[PDB]
């Protein structure tokens, strides 16, 4: 917790010496958002895409899977591996299987 505090306080210190230092003139249009020169046609709205979630959700459901993969190194030392080993393979198959199902339903 000590190193967390010293790091965050360090960074915050850099912020404060970043703002309260140059000591010059902010003003309008200088502070207007950048848009490669010409002014924006409108504030940021809806860059909608199914192609975002259509995969990103799959990310989420793999990440849940790897969450189950993590116990493995410790589970490897269990007294009865034949009881284990199938499962150690099993989930991975389904992981692959899930992917496989996605792979070809386009």
């Amino acid at each position: 917790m000590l190193t967390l505090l010293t790091n965050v306080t360090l960074a915050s210190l850099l912020v404060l010496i970043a703002f309260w230092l140059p000591q010059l003139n902010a003003y309008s249009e200088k502070t207007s958002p950048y848009e490669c020169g010409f002014d924006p046609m409108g504030s940021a709205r809806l860059p909608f895409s199914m192609k975002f979630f259509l995969v990103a959700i799959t990310f989420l459901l793999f990440d849940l899977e790897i969450a189950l993969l993590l116990p493995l190194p410790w589970a490897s030392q269990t007294n009865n591996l034949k009881t284990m080993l199938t499962m150690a393979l099993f989930l991975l198959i389904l992981l692959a299987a899930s992917l496989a199902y996605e792979w070809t339903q386009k």
Partner: protein, 90 residues
């Protein structure tokens, strides 16, 4: 029961009341639900750590899974409702 548990339980009660006060675009509700999920998780894990009831060390993570899983589903429905409107519960 030690006060800490009471505090987490209360965090649950808020994590529910927030779901049910329920307002505007519903994405907030999937958040509040996930918060609810997290409170149940923590409240479980503290217990399994307490009594050294070792087998149940497996549950919280498994809990987490399905719970996260349904939430993972939930966004998809929102997509569809977002698809025809730009979402609002209204």
């Amino acid at each position: 029961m030690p006060l800490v548990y009471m505090n987490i339980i209360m965090a649950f009660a808020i994590a529910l009341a927030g779901l049910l006060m329920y307002r505007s675009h519903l994405m907030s509700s999937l958040l509040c639900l996930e918060g609810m999920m997290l409170s149940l998780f923590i409240m479980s894990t503290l217990i399994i750590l307490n009594t050294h009831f070792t087998l149940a060390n497996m549950m919280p993570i498994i809990l987490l899974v399905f719970a996260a899983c349904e939430a993972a589903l939930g966004l998809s429905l929102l997509v569809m409702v977002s698809n025809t409107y730009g979402t609002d519960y209204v």
